């Protein structure tokens, strides 16, 4: 088509997309239609002459919508990794219409500047800033896997220069075999991957009761490993674990890493966004010790998933995505972004409130952010049983996890549209099905 054809249909699509996102409350979260349903609803060959815009859209409703998940719904109570906000859409449209540094000066320079905005919001210490401070600085990365690996490698080269200056006899090959990296037991798998690819030994540190790495567990490991003749050169401290909202004590672990020449990489994951809010910055005291810091701004700052921000204490050791950041940050503002996260933590506690009040359910981990780790008091069996009925119903979606030897339900409030109305309706549904589940147990 030509341009002013596109003015019309584009403006129509805006409308279709608007309505979907308004009435999405009514859609069923999981597709209630079976593999193979689609072939016989559509012509076996392409049309010769163009179909109308009018007829295509209707097919979108009638043929496409039934066969789609609709993750964007308030009742999808898990993290939706490819979610996008409205500003992110607006940007996407433009980012598409445009399509190295020398290729795109703006794309590159915007990245550096947005990194600084992000920086300040989180109030990282000043060394981290790209603001021509000439020390530290940050970068966007494809994944939080990339990021962990980058710091790992940087960590490894560093230790080999320092150990080989020490004794010019030792080979790089001899050193590498002794290298050990650490992470909590609730470490993201992206740590294992990193260490695997970087060719070193990865060991878990036992988490404390609240699933935080607590130094005594770290120090022992250190002692056990320095004494078997291994070498510790790197470690991931996770803030906001993906299992639950667990936070590694940075204030105890940091000081140790400094003293033992262990590179400190802080994986804040998703939770990191929450440090734009003062109530949470205390979970981030200790960053002073870290050598790198990485988080995904997608879940709470509404930015494109494509983007994983990472900073470093020294720059020497180390798609048009900055445009969306720019839009989203500009269109919500820090306060809006703040109000956004805050609105979710409050629904998250609201839900916790509901679970405490019922004596058949327990809470497993202190509820700090959006997610609530709960379960039905009794066997893992009972609970496996219960998750099954919820998904079988196709009214809400929940994912589980295991803490220790315990099966857990994760209720996570991340969607842009969620209200306490939905949380209420979600609880009660869970409530009812738990009654039916409970009957069955006794048989």
CB 287 within 8 A of CB 248: no
The CA-CA-CA angle for residues 144, 147, 152, to 5°, reads 130
Residue 294 assigned to a binding site: no
Taking the least distance from each CB to a copy of itself, the nearer of 70 and 203 is 70
339 binds, among a copy of itself, Cl ion, none (CB under 5 to 8 A by kind): none
Tokens matching residue 288:
């002073």
Q: Kindly tell me which of 47 and 168 has the beta carbon lying closer to a copy of itself.
A: 47
Last residue before each gap in the chain (C to N over 2.5 A): 99, 318
Q: Which does 121 bind (CB under 5 to 8 A by kind): Cl ion, a copy of itself, none?
A: a copy of itself
Is 188 annotated in some ligand binding site? yes
Q: Which does 271 bind (CB under 5 to 8 A by kind): Cl ion, a copy of itself, none?
A: Cl ion
Place of tokens 């997608």: 298
| Contact partners, residue 78, CB within 8 Å, separation at least 6 | 397, 398, 399, 410, 412, 414
- Nearer to a copy of itself among residue 98 and residue 197 (C-beta): 98
Residue 270 interacts with, from a copy of itself, Cl ion, none (CB under 5-8 Å by kind): Cl ion
Please state the φ and ψ torsions of residue 438, each to the nearest 5 degrees: -70, -45
Burial label for 158, CB within 10 Å (0-12, 13-18, 19+), is middle
Nearest approach in angstroms of CB 156 to a copy of itself is 21
Q: Which is nearer to a copy of itself, 254 or 297 (CB)?
A: 297
For residue 151, give the 3-state DSSP assignment: helix
Nearest-approach distance from CB 300 to Cl ion, in angstroms: 7
Find the shortest distance in angstroms from Cβ 240 to Cl ion.
5
**Residue closer to a copy of itself (CB basis): 109 or 436:** 109
In angstroms, what is the minimal distance from the CB of 237 to Cl ion? 16
CA 195 remoteness from chain centre: 20
Select 280 or 427, whichever has its Cβ closest to Cl ion: 280
Contact partner, 169, from a copy of itself, Cl ion, none, Cβ < 5-8 Å per class: none
| CB atoms closer than 10 angstroms to residue 133 | 13
- Residue ranges that bind Cl ion, judged by CB under 5 A: 240, 270-271
Minimum distance of a copy of itself from residue 60's CB (angstroms): 7
296 assigned to a ligand binding site = yes
Q: How far is the CB of 305 from a copy of itself (least distance, A)?
A: 8
CB 244 within 8 A of CB 364: yes
Interacting partner of 223 out of a copy of itself, Cl ion, none (Cβ under 5 to 8 A depending on kind): none
Q: Which residues pair with residue 141 across a beta bridge?
A: 308
Q: How far apart are CA 5 and CA 24, in angstroms?
A: 28
Which of residues 319 and 377 has its CB atom nearest to a copy of itself in the complex? Answer: 319
144 is in an annotated binding site: yes
- The number of CA neighbours under 13 Å toward the Cβ of 398 is 28
Nearer to Cl ion, 198 or 240 (CB): 240
Binding at 60: pick from a copy of itself, Cl ion, none (beta carbon under 5-8 Å per type): a copy of itself
| First-last CA distance in the chain | 65
Return the sign of the alpha-carbon dihedral for residues 93, 98, 100, 106.
Answer: negative
Contacted entry of a copy of itself, Cl ion, none for residue 5, CB cut-off 5 to 8 Å set by kind? a copy of itself
Annotated ligand binding at 265? The verdict is: no
Contact 242, 278 (CB under 8 A): no
CB of residue 269 to Cl ion, shortest distance in Å: 6
Judge whether 145 is annotated as a binding position.
yes
Sheet holding 406-412, edge to edge: 76-77, 397-403, 406-412, 371-376, 361-363
Rg (CA), the chain: 25
Sequence ranges of the binding site: 82, 144-145, 188, 242, 296
Sequence ranges of the binding site for substrate: 82, 188
Sequence ranges of the binding site for pyridoxal 5'-phosphate: 144-145, 242, 296
């Amino acid at each position: 088509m030509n341009a002013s054809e596109f003015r019309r249909r584009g403006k129509e699509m805006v409308d279709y997309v608007a309505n979907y996102m308004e009435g999405i409350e009514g859609r069923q979260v999981y597709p209630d239609v079976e593999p193979g349903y689609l072939r016989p609803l559509i012509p076996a060959a392409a049309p010769q002459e163009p179909d109308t815009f009018e007829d295509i859209i209707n097919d979108v409703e009638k043929i496409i919508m039934p066969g789609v998940t609709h993750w964007h719904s308030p009742y999808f109570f898990a993290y939706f990794p490819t979610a996008s906000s409205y500003p992110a859409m607006l940007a996407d449209m433009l980012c598409g219409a445009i399509g190295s540094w020398a290729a795109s000066p703006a794309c590159t320079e915007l990245e550096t500047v947005m990194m600084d905005w992000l920086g300040k919001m989180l109030e990282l210490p000043k060394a981290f800033l790209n603001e021509k401070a000439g020390e530290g600085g940050g970068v966007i990365q494809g994944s939080a896997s990339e990021a962990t690996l980058v710091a790992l490698l940087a960590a490894r080269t560093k230790v080999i220069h320092r150990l080989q200056a020490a004794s010019p006899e030792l080979t790089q090959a001899a050193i590498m075999e002794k290298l050990v990296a650490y992470s909590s037991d609730q470490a993201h798998s992206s740590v294992e991957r990193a260490g695997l690819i970087g060719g070193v030994k990865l060991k878990a540190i036992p988490s404390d009761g609240n699933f935080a790495m607590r130094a005594s567990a770290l120090q022992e490991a250190l002692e056990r490993d320095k004494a078997a003749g291994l070498i510790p050169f790197f470690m991931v401290a996770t803030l906001g674990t993906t299992t639950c909202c667990s936070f590694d004590n940075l204030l105890e672990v940091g000081p140790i890493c400094n003293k033992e020449d262990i590179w400190l990489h802080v994986d804040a994951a998703y939770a990191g966004s929450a440090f734009i809010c003062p109530e949470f910055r205390h979970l981030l005291n200790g960053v002073e010790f870290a050598d790198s810091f990485n988080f995904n701004p997608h879940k709470w700052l509404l930015v494109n998933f494509d983007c994983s921000a990472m900073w470093v204490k020294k720059r020497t050791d180390l798609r048009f995505r900055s445009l969306k950041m720019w839009f989203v940050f500009r269109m919500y503002g820090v306060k809006g972004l703040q109000a956004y996260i805050r609105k979710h933590v409050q629904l998250s506690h609201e839900f916790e409130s509901l679970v405490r009040q019922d004596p058949r359910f327990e809470i497993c981990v202190e509820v700090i952010l959006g997610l609530v780790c709960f379960r039905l008091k009794g066997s893992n069996k009972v609970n496996e049983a219960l998750l099954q009925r919820i998904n079988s119903a196709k009214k809400i979606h929940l994912v589980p996890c295991h803490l220790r030897d315990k099966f857990v339900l994760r209720f996570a409030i991340c969607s842009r549209t969620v209200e306490s109305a939905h949380v209420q309706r979600a609880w009660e549904h869970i409530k009812e099905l738990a009654a039916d589940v409970l009957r069955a147990e006794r048989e």
